[PDB]
Amino acid sequence: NLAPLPPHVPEHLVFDFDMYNPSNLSAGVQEAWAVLQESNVPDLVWTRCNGGHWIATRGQLIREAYEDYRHFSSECPFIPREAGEAYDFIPTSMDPPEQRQFRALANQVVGMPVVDKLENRIQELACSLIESLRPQGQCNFTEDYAEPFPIRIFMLLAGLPEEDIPHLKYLTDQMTRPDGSMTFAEAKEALYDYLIPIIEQRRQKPGTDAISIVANGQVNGRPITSDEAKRMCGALLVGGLDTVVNFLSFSMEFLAKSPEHRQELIERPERIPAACEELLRRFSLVADGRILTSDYEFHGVQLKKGDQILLPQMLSGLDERENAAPMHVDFSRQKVSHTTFGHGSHLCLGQHLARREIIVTLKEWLTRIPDFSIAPGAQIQHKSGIVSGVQALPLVWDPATTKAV
Numbered sequence: 001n002l003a004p005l006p007p008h009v010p011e012h013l014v015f016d017f018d019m020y021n022p023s024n025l026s027a028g029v030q031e032a033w034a035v036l037q038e039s040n041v042p043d044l045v046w047t048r049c050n051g052g053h054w055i056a057t058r059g060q061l062i063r064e065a066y067e068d069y070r071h072f073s074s075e076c077p078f079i080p081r082e083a084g085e086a087y088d089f090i091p092t093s094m095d096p097p098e099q100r101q102f103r104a105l106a107n108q109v110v111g112m113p114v115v116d117k118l119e120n121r122i123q124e125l126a127c128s129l130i131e132s133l134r135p136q137g138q139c140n141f142t143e144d145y146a147e148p149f150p151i152r153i154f155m156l157l158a159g160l161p162e163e164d165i166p167h168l169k170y171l172t173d174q175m176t177r178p179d180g181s182m183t184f185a186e187a188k189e190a191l192y193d194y195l196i197p198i199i200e201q202r203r204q205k206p207g208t209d210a211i212s213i214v215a216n217g218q219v220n221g222r223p224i225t226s227d228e229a230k231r232m233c234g235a236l237l238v239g240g241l242d243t244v245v246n247f248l249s250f251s252m253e254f255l256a257k258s259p260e261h262r263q264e265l266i267e268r269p270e271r272i273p274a275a276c277e278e279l280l281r282r283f284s285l286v287a288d289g290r291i292l293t294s295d296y297e298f299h300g301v302q303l304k305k306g307d308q309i310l311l312p313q314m315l316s317g318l319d320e321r322e323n324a325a326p327m328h329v330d331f332s333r334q335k336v337s338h339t340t341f342g343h344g345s346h347l348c349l350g351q352h353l354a355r356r357e358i359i360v361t362l363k364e365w366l367t368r369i370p371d372f373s374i375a376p377g378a379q380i381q382h383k384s385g386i387v388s389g390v391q392a393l394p395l396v397w398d399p400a401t402t403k404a405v
């Protein structure tokens with residue numbers, strides 16, 4: 001379904017890209033989004049899909065817009081407009097300077113310091129999880145590791161019982177890839193209902209878990225309110241439940257289809273870190289945007305106040321103008337340029353946790369299960385949305401080849 005073209009949007013700039021259901025989705029989700037960068041597509045286009053909105057197709061514009069919060073506000077970061085308007089997570093929907101305070105408190109619960117004191121657990125969990133699968137000679141990756149691994153760590157992080165994983169997970173998925181059952185608002189409201197009671201209890205006594213830290217936090221002056229606490233916790237759900245999870249499946253799907261790259265890491269461990277960044281560029285997966293604060297001519301195009309513009313974080317690193325032969329995975333890429341963890345004042349606060357989980361996965365997995373491949377005769381399917389992901393990943397291997405360390 002297409003929205004009628006607003007009077008102010010050029011005739012020649014219309015490219016009906018459906019961010020939640022791209023035409024070339026069959027060739028991989030990153031490949032589907034890459035069409036927006038073909039020789040005949042303007043740097044900045046307008047799509048009549050999902051309420052109609054702009055779409056910067058080049059990392060140059062993307063990076064640029066993400067730096068100018070004065071014009072491109074995070075107030076309404078999601079598409080459709082109903083989703084963005086409803087989006088009120090702190091600080092992801094705030095613009096500087098208001099953001100500073102909250103982002104600083106949020107940084108306390110997932111930043112590097114937290115990731116370092118968690119390294120051992122993260123590592124132990126990966127091993128424990130993999131050692132379990134190893135003798136099976138097969139697995140449904142997305143659900144057997146890609147999900148349990150990041151989520152349990154996040155739940156331990158937040159101090160939330162693991163029983164709530166399916167619940168919190170489903171709702172979170174509705175904010176990134178709506179199955180259609182519920183709107184963004186409803187999903188958000190549902191998550192808030194889960195958090196609020198928890199915040200109330202934790203607000204009392206201190207606490208090492210994320211929710212406590214936030215609930216007992218102090219932003220610009222007075223103590224943090226429950227609503228603020230709520231909005232802050234929310235901003236952590238997508239990352240702790242839906243981003244890493246999907247990223248691992250993309251990266252692992254690739255590794256299963258490319259023995260070469262696997263062998264390379266297996267016999268050249270030291271390259272795992274660099275390999276992680278390249279996979280982060282290649283299989284980048286987030287794409288949100290901003291809303292115009294006023295009428296503004298941006299690169300020849302006249303944007304009106306209230307317009308929404310999609311700045312796919314996943315496109316920068318695929319832009320041939322920033323990375324030669326972008327669709328090729330080269331662990332030895334001299335300059336791995338990308339905006340996978342975003343760009344600007346909203347740079348991902350969990351990228352450290354992300355990278356560690358990715359590095360621990362590649363390390364522990366390849367060591368114990370170096371030789372594996374996609375189950376015989378199976379097609380891997382992707383899904384596109386605020387956060388694209390992999391539907392399922394059937395992997396198989398011979399147990400005799402596995403190892404225990």
Ligand code: HEM
Pocket residue numbers: 074077090091092093103106110154235236237238239240241243244247284285286288289313339340341342343345346347348349350351353354355
């Ligand atoms: C590999 C996985 C991940 C990717 C690709 C990713 C990507 C991003 C991107 C592109 C943004 C910018 C959003 C915007 O500007 O509107 C962002 C923000 C954010 N991410 Fe992540 N992220 C990942 C994992 C995580 C994890 C595991 C967490 C922690 C639970 C997390 C927490 C956050 C937070 C709190 C923000 C908001 C920062 C702010 O508004 O100041 N992310 N992420």
